[PDB]
Design a binder for this molecule. Structure first.
Ligand SMILES: C[C@H](OP(=O)(O)OP(=O)(O)OP(=O)(O)OC[C@H]1O[C@@H](n2cnc3c(=O)[nH]c(N)nc32)[C@H](O)[C@@H]1O)c1ccccc1[N+](=O)[O-]
Ligand SMILES: *CC(=O)N(C)CCN(C)c1ccc([N+](=O)[O-])c2nonc12
Ligand SMILES: [Mg+2]
Length: 166
């Protein structure tokens, strides 16, 4: 196959486990579980191409370590997720982006910025500001809900399109 190796990164509670379980299994979860399953794999068709996604769902309240580096370094593209009702998570995006670049030892990594939990009202992270963030880094910005499935495909499939183009 062409495999696409995706790593989903970002802060505690942002919806990384849920976004991926929604893509790999087509259902929504809700369960305070810091465990991280082996990689999620799924043959899919993206823009007509049959391919294997292999998605590493990582941990949110974890400091950088060699162990985390050991897991992350195999990824080809990175989904950088915050929650639109969590300002800390959006600000932490800078760290996560900078961490990814250092781990991959590269000035140009395929990434997509994802603002998750779009179904929730009274958002705190202004949409325009995430677009400006994503723009200033030169990456796509997708808004998602692991709950309603809005954007879950756009977000991930765009990340595959960024791998192809790098
Ligand atoms: C330890 C773990 O930290 P974590 O594993 O780093 O956290 P995740 O980023 O994987 O977070 P998860 O996907 O489990 O989603 C967190 C909570 O928000 C809910 N959620 C996820 N996406 C959405 C969405 O789009 N909309 C709505 N309305 N809700 C959503 C989930 O059902 C869950 O209750 C963790 C940290 C903080 C909080 C929870 C948590 N957890 O395990 O559940
Ligand atoms: C599901 C879960 O998070 N736990 C079992 C850990 C204990 N709890 C309930 C916990 C830990 C940490 C934080 N936090 O610092 O954000 C919590 N906030 O609400 N419950 C928390
Ligand atoms: Mg999780």
């Amino acid at each position: 196959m062409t495999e696409y190796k995706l790593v989903v990164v970002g802060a505690g509670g942002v919806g990384k486990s849920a976004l991926t379980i929604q893509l790999i299994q087509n259902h929504f979860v809700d369960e305070c579980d810091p465990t991280i399953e082996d990689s999620y794999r799924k043959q899919v068709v993206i823009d007509g191409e049959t391919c294997l996604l292999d998605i590493l769902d990582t941990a949110g309240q974890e400091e950088y370590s060699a162990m985390r580096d050991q897991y992350m370094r195999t990824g080809e593209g990175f989904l950088c997720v915050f929650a639109i009702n969590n300002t800390k998570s959006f600000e932490d995006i800078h760290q996560y982006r900078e961490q990814i670049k250092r781990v991959k030892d590269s000035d140009d990594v395929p990434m997509v910025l994802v603002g998750n939990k779009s179904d929730l009202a009274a958002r705190t992270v202004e949409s325009r500001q995430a677009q400006d963030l994503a723009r200033s880094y030169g990456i796509p910005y997708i808004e998602t809900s692991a709950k309603t499935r809005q954007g879950v495909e756009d977000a991930f499939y765009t990340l595959v399109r960024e791998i192809r183009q790098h």
